Amino acid sequence: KEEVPDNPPNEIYATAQQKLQDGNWRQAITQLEALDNRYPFGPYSQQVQLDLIYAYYKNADLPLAQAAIDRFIRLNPTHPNIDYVMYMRGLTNMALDDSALQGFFGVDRSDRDPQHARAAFSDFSKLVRGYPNSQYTTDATKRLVFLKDRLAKYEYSVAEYYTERGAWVAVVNRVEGMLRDYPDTQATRDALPLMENAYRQMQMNAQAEKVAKIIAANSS
Amino acid sequence: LFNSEEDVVKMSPLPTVENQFTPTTAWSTSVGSGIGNFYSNLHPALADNVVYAADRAGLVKALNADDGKEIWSVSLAEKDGWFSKEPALLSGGVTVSGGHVYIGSEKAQVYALNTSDGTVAWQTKVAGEALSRPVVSDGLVLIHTSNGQLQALNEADGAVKWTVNLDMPSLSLRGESAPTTAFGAAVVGGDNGRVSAVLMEQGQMIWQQRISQATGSTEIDRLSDVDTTPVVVNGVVFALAYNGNLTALDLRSGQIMWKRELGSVNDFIVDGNRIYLVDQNDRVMALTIDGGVTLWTQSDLLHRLLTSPVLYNGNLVVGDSEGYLHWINVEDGRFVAQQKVDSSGFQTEPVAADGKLLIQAKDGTVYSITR
Amino acid sequence: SRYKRQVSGDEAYLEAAPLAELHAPAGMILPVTSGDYAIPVTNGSGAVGKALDIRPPAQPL
Amino acid sequence: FVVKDIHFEGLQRVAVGAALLSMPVRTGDTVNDEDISNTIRALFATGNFEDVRVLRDGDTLLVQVKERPTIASITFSGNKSVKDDMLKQNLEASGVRVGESLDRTTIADIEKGLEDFYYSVGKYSASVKAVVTPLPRNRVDLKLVFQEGVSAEIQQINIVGNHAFTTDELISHFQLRDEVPWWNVVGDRKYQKQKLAGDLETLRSYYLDRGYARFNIDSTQVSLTPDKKGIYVTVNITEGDQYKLSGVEVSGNLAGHSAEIEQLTKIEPGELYNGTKVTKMEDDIKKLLGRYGYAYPRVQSMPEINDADKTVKLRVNVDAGNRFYVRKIRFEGNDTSKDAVLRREMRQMEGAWLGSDLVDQGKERLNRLGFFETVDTDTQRVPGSPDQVDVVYKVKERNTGSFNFGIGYGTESGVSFQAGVQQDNWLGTGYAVGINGTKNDYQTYAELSVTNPYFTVDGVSLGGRLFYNDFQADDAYTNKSYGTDVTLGFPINEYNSLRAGLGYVHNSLSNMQPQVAMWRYLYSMGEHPSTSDQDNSFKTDDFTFNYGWTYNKLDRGYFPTDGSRVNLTGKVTIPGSDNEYYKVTLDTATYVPIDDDHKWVVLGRTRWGYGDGLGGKEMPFYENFYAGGSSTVRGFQSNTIGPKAVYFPHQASNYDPDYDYECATQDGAKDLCKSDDAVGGNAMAVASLEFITPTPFISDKYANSVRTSFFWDMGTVWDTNWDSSQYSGYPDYSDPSNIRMSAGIALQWMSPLGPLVFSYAQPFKKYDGDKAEQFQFNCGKTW
Amino acid sequence: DWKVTARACLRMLMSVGLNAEIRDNVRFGLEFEKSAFGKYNVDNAVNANFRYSF
Amino acid sequence: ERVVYRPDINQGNYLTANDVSKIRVGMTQQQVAYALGTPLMSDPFGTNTWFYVFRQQPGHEGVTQQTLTLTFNSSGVLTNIDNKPALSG
């Protein structure tokens, strides 16, 4: 680390704010957590938590940042600028997904444990429905339109190995659970031709004509 | 992994010597291969100028007390096999009463070898391994096994007469302190502090008693248990505990007199109401008469594992775990005398009979010592 | 350094396909939904993409 | 009295609102000294800082608490045998963790609470000294130091009360060890309270398989000597008597299934009681009901031991659920690993019923997959329906991958480079593309395996591989062979497999000595080398076709005592190769127990594989079979059993490598060197039988990791057609009746670092020309 | 973090060595392999690897 | 009969010969849920029809199916119990 020379004053946070508004997080993170470690009670104690969360997020920090957010939410769940802390908490959950490989981003990662996307859609919905007159509300809907589609493409991708294995009840259940969760998204009007290859594979020709009555009338 | 096995206590640096006696060893004789590293009391007995021995794996001899020659080198081992045999783990000091020689074992056995030729007279299995000395008391051969039992065998031929059960903690220290005779009784000790006063004839427990405090921690700081040497004299009953005060009891009632905490580990000795002890740190604390003064003590032998006192003509002879024999005085002990280095370590109780000073090493090299 | 794409911000979530509803044909019924459902528009003037300044409150006073 | 003004002076660290709400009194309340006492209790319970004083004189309540440095800046000293994070999480879950305003009346408390943990680890010293230095503005830097000694050592575990059985054979199957020598390492003298309850259970499980039905452990004591360095344990077994099994009658509530259970519970009258054949009969009934649509089968059995006779009559009852549907599968925890590779390693279809064995045998395959650390499982009942459940697995990756890089020295062979990376997890699915390299001063090896184990997904693998070998060496030939191959992995069932695939290799050899043993390969296939010059070369293009079937019924981890294993390999160059031949390789490793005790066994291994070319052209000499060494025929040197080559006056060897090549090299034997160092013929047939006896003579405590043996080796390697024209000056090499038997003794040894194989054989039958040597201590043998 | 293991045998049947992994599963092994390159010769080539477990 | 590898494939609603023979006309939609178990597939397309399908693929060269299809009227009463114990090929 480094011996930050804060005598009493905010002259130690001045150089940390200057380094934060400099495109350099790793050097300005210790400069913030030191003032946080030694003076987390005075006037310069409320802004240090938000400035530290913003420095941990831009530095691509692990759930330690989520814990720092959940600690700011637990102590004082009342703030005229509270919609930012929930947006950041949803942003970390959303950003905890895009890896797709050991060190590269080349393949369409949409079927790798979608437990964090469901751990972000909930918070984004709670934010967009609680305070609808904020400034971070326009991007929340544009992010949910993609996040819910991403879970639709995971359901459609988990409902495809069972249709080639030979178990024509699992794809039926997974499409029934998709037609009532993400109906108006993508990867759902394309799994209808995948529920018809199962209802017809179990001698139910009198029940697959209903699927081939939405396929031929509710699509192109 | 530079080097493991560090140290914490760094025991005494073996200070200087003030020899005024220069004690010598008349003779010595090895007896098989002793315990080596297993903690088990095994001291040589003595009868009509004949000193016996023992072993944890094999033979038990009857070497002479003036020359050191064998009389009967019986094996007392088990059967054989393809190319090796299995040993008979023996523990418990040798006891002599008339013409019998009782030796306990760690396989629930009690051998009764004769003095004529060493032929076993009788053998009866007991419950639990024997870790205490067989106590001869008006025929009875009461023995405190390592199970909380006080089985009292007969002298003629086996005939286990009666056993008494005692409580046992989760993790105890040792199953020592076989009982002693007291006007036709048996003042036995026992684990977990309790000290019983069972009867001689059938074993009806007259009274029990707590000996020290407990609840210091989960298991480690409440390990207090009297297992050293229940002694009775002038009606007063002393019995050394492990953590707290020793004892102050009575034959009939058993009420608590003076409760001096000083002295709590092993082998107190009464020689005229002058009780010398060691207590959790190998210092010779000559305890008081009844509470208070605690006349004097020692500080040169700290953390050097010593043994039971010997009291050779007033001088408090005692050996440490390195093989030294620093003599002590009786009024103000300041290193009166000391012997040379006897290797292999000393871990058994040195017997102090009339004359000689027999003591067994960790392999068996008993020395008669004079000055 | 396994998560460096969605840190500085990018237009990856944007330009996605819209959410078009499904209108059942006359005679049959659809498996009515519940739970995960897109909230109403609630439009405004907030920036989207890289124009929205992700920063803590001003002072914050 | 009505208070009018609340007086709070100083407000050091507690919030103003918190200080206001902590006080049950406000402006305009009438209270007494009892409520003042309750306020003192509240200030003591809030735990920030409590140096309080109360004064009530006029109209205001003067309650004030003095500040004190009572923050949590724990730092650890030089602990030796403990990790820095264990005490960290201990103090986290139990106190002084950052904040919480640690007080002065808790230092001894946390000291004892941490010492009772050192006691649990097994270090009975517990010397902890914790000081707190006060920093300005209510800060303390608490620093603790440790003074620990040597831990405890497991002393004798002598058992009292056991008859008809030696004391050492019992501890042989124990976990807590008390005698670890430099000879081998199986355990360690370390006390573990959790491990004692498993040893006390395996003792019962071992003493019950012999018919000793009555079994009750009276007491199990554990003690330690003063100046604690050793620990003694005692077990009081009571055997009672021996009994035999009489009846296995079954009764309970079954869905008309007794007709197939009476066939699984029948027993032979007179058989001795077996303590592990009942646990297996229970698991065999727990499977017949599970296969019929029952999730959790409950089976119990009570033995009815009848006294005054050797009879026990077990009574068994069963009850197994109703339907317990399992129509859900969810995987969570995997990152950068596709879901599609987790569902193919298990046998549990979604929507079907639940089997208590399928969801447990899928975890075994998920563990055997390889790129997983911990794989848990949980079966949760959904709200509503009482039978439909969801099974979820919690996995954690291991971060598979490697990058090997090595450089050699001047070791009389030259500097050698080595570089390899596979990482085994190329992209999500589970490919294993890797690149290797062994760049020595003569070798230029390189691996290019791009194997794929689940193409056409039923269990069948498919793997391509490229290679380049440049093994510049001598024979008395500098080879250079490059190609590729692609084979599949057809799985039949457990302990069975079948591989088949295509291949191609172009090989060119040069700088070879003209030995007549291999000097009919070119004279028949087009070429016609001269008997004067040596720089001649030769090269072919091969189109191979490999096949084979695998079988490994070992039924043991690494010390087989029963079973067998056979494998065959083939190669045919059908349509376009410059040389047509075929080479089989069959070998068995069967084991045979002589009695109902896994201590006296006798095994026998054979090897075959005679193969000759077809089409009027001979078989290449670089694919010949070599036999010998400590692997096939113990007692002989490395791979020198075949026919001995001989040369002719072709001494132009182009500046001989100075003793690297001998025997009619440029400065060798002019006429008929009659070479040693034989070259293996096409035919081959070896066999060896070997008895195994217990090791004499060591203590029974560690007498199960030696496994000495008496073997008897033999074999032969001849050439089907060497020659018959005027070559009657050398021993005939076409006679298969040239076996060279060699018996001896073998001494395996599981050292503290791997296994080793020691063998001192003695060849008692040999002909003219044989390199004999003994004491071959080859290691690494685990197959 | 010095965490040597001193493995021995886990064509060569040789190379007793150690595993000096410290920070990120990166070792400093020094094997003593003794392999047969021809037919009857096992001489040399002690070596040392890197073992970068990325 | 290509004997290489084919795991056992079973799909839901294990039926017997002593459970189907208890269903009669118009009892309720409740006793049917506890006599044989909760159905594995319903028809969300605006009807109360339940599908009890017992299909298994045992080993090699075998497919057996039993399509027990029953439909309940509005608010309880069953009227059109239908059993199909043979896989129509």
mmCIF file of C-alpha atoms in Angstrom, chain A residues 46-154:
data_model
loop_
_atom_site.group_PDB
_atom_site.id
_atom_site.type_symbol
_atom_site.label_atom_id
_atom_site.label_comp_id
_atom_site.label_asym_id
_atom_site.label_seq_id
_atom_site.Cartn_x
_atom_site.Cartn_y
_atom_site.Cartn_z
ATOM 1 C CA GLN A 46 -21.380 9.748 3.708
ATOM 2 C CA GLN A 47 -19.805 10.772 0.385
ATOM 3 C CA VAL A 48 -16.856 8.390 0.925
ATOM 4 C CA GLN A 49 -19.108 5.314 0.699
ATOM 5 C CA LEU A 50 -20.658 6.351 -2.627
ATOM 6 C CA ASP A 51 -17.279 7.459 -3.990
ATOM 7 C CA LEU A 52 -15.815 4.118 -2.880
ATOM 8 C CA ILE A 53 -18.606 2.086 -4.494
ATOM 9 C CA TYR A 54 -18.112 4.059 -7.715
ATOM 10 C CA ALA A 55 -14.360 3.364 -7.535
ATOM 11 C CA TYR A 56 -14.848 -0.357 -6.858
ATOM 12 C CA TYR A 57 -17.313 -0.762 -9.739
ATOM 13 C CA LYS A 58 -15.133 1.021 -12.307
ATOM 14 C CA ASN A 59 -12.234 -1.178 -11.132
ATOM 15 C CA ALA A 60 -14.210 -4.387 -11.887
ATOM 16 C CA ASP A 61 -14.294 -5.535 -8.240
ATOM 17 C CA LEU A 62 -15.783 -8.848 -7.064
ATOM 18 C CA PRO A 63 -18.840 -9.174 -4.696
ATOM 19 C CA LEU A 64 -16.909 -7.133 -2.108
ATOM 20 C CA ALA A 65 -18.518 -4.179 -3.905
ATOM 21 C CA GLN A 66 -21.961 -5.778 -3.603
ATOM 22 C CA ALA A 67 -21.316 -6.179 0.127
ATOM 23 C CA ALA A 68 -20.285 -2.526 0.382
ATOM 24 C CA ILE A 69 -23.561 -1.622 -1.354
ATOM 25 C CA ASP A 70 -25.662 -3.883 0.906
ATOM 26 C CA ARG A 71 -23.953 -2.217 3.878
ATOM 27 C CA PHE A 72 -24.892 1.269 2.667
ATOM 28 C CA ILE A 73 -28.470 0.060 2.175
ATOM 29 C CA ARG A 74 -28.685 -1.559 5.624
ATOM 30 C CA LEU A 75 -27.520 1.316 7.844
ATOM 31 C CA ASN A 76 -29.595 4.180 6.381
ATOM 32 C CA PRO A 77 -32.357 3.091 3.979
ATOM 33 C CA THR A 78 -33.408 6.725 3.515
ATOM 34 C CA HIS A 79 -31.752 9.124 1.076
ATOM 35 C CA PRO A 80 -32.981 11.708 -1.474
ATOM 36 C CA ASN A 81 -30.415 10.093 -3.829
ATOM 37 C CA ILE A 82 -31.188 6.441 -3.103
ATOM 38 C CA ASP A 83 -32.063 5.408 -6.681
ATOM 39 C CA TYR A 84 -28.340 5.457 -7.519
ATOM 40 C CA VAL A 85 -27.357 2.800 -4.952
ATOM 41 C CA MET A 86 -29.952 0.356 -6.315
ATOM 42 C CA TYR A 87 -28.899 1.083 -9.900
ATOM 43 C CA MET A 88 -25.302 0.282 -8.953
ATOM 44 C CA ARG A 89 -26.377 -2.906 -7.160
ATOM 45 C CA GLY A 90 -28.223 -4.043 -10.285
ATOM 46 C CA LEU A 91 -25.304 -3.010 -12.478
ATOM 47 C CA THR A 92 -22.861 -5.219 -10.566
ATOM 48 C CA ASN A 93 -25.241 -8.184 -10.872
ATOM 49 C CA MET A 94 -25.553 -7.538 -14.610
ATOM 50 C CA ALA A 95 -21.781 -7.142 -15.084
ATOM 51 C CA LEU A 96 -21.036 -10.334 -13.112
ATOM 52 C CA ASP A 97 -22.119 -12.348 -16.183
ATOM 53 C CA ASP A 98 -20.141 -11.228 -19.244
ATOM 54 C CA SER A 99 -17.088 -13.491 -19.215
ATOM 55 C CA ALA A 100 -17.899 -16.140 -21.865
ATOM 56 C CA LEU A 101 -14.367 -17.592 -21.654
ATOM 57 C CA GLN A 102 -11.218 -17.661 -19.543
ATOM 58 C CA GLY A 103 -9.923 -14.315 -20.802
ATOM 59 C CA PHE A 104 -11.765 -13.466 -24.025
ATOM 60 C CA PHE A 105 -15.262 -12.446 -25.149
ATOM 61 C CA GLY A 106 -15.907 -14.319 -28.382
ATOM 62 C CA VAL A 107 -18.826 -16.707 -27.902
ATOM 63 C CA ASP A 108 -22.491 -15.897 -27.238
ATOM 64 C CA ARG A 109 -22.711 -16.610 -23.515
ATOM 65 C CA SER A 110 -26.423 -17.090 -22.806
ATOM 66 C CA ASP A 111 -26.636 -20.489 -21.053
ATOM 67 C CA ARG A 112 -24.114 -20.216 -18.195
ATOM 68 C CA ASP A 113 -25.961 -20.213 -14.843
ATOM 69 C CA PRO A 114 -28.422 -17.297 -15.325
ATOM 70 C CA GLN A 115 -28.799 -16.804 -11.566
ATOM 71 C CA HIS A 116 -27.282 -13.296 -11.522
ATOM 72 C CA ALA A 117 -29.537 -11.969 -14.297
ATOM 73 C CA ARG A 118 -32.519 -13.012 -12.180
ATOM 74 C CA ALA A 119 -30.645 -11.380 -9.275
ATOM 75 C CA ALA A 120 -30.640 -8.111 -11.256
ATOM 76 C CA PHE A 121 -34.008 -8.030 -13.046
ATOM 77 C CA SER A 122 -35.722 -8.002 -9.645
ATOM 78 C CA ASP A 123 -33.746 -5.007 -8.370
ATOM 79 C CA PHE A 124 -34.126 -3.128 -11.661
ATOM 80 C CA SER A 125 -37.894 -3.701 -11.579
ATOM 81 C CA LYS A 126 -38.101 -2.585 -7.945
ATOM 82 C CA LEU A 127 -36.180 0.556 -8.918
ATOM 83 C CA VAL A 128 -38.254 1.354 -12.018
ATOM 84 C CA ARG A 129 -41.576 0.823 -10.201
ATOM 85 C CA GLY A 130 -40.695 2.605 -6.953
ATOM 86 C CA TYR A 131 -39.346 5.913 -8.255
ATOM 87 C CA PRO A 132 -40.519 6.382 -11.878
ATOM 88 C CA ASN A 133 -39.440 10.055 -12.051
ATOM 89 C CA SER A 134 -35.706 9.503 -11.510
ATOM 90 C CA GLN A 135 -32.948 10.017 -14.092
ATOM 91 C CA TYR A 136 -31.722 6.393 -14.272
ATOM 92 C CA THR A 137 -35.160 5.065 -15.277
ATOM 93 C CA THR A 138 -34.894 5.370 -19.072
ATOM 94 C CA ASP A 139 -31.981 2.896 -19.194
ATOM 95 C CA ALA A 140 -33.588 0.413 -16.782
ATOM 96 C CA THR A 141 -36.341 -0.534 -19.243
ATOM 97 C CA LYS A 142 -33.859 -0.745 -22.126
ATOM 98 C CA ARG A 143 -31.794 -3.104 -19.958
ATOM 99 C CA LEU A 144 -34.763 -5.275 -18.935
ATOM 100 C CA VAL A 145 -35.786 -5.705 -22.585
ATOM 101 C CA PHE A 146 -32.414 -7.425 -23.087
ATOM 102 C CA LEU A 147 -32.180 -9.165 -19.699
ATOM 103 C CA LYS A 148 -35.545 -10.936 -20.007
ATOM 104 C CA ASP A 149 -34.722 -11.890 -23.598
ATOM 105 C CA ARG A 150 -31.455 -13.390 -22.298
ATOM 106 C CA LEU A 151 -33.400 -15.665 -19.934
ATOM 107 C CA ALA A 152 -35.720 -16.503 -22.828
ATOM 108 C CA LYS A 153 -32.688 -17.643 -24.862
ATOM 109 C CA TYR A 154 -31.541 -19.739 -21.870
#
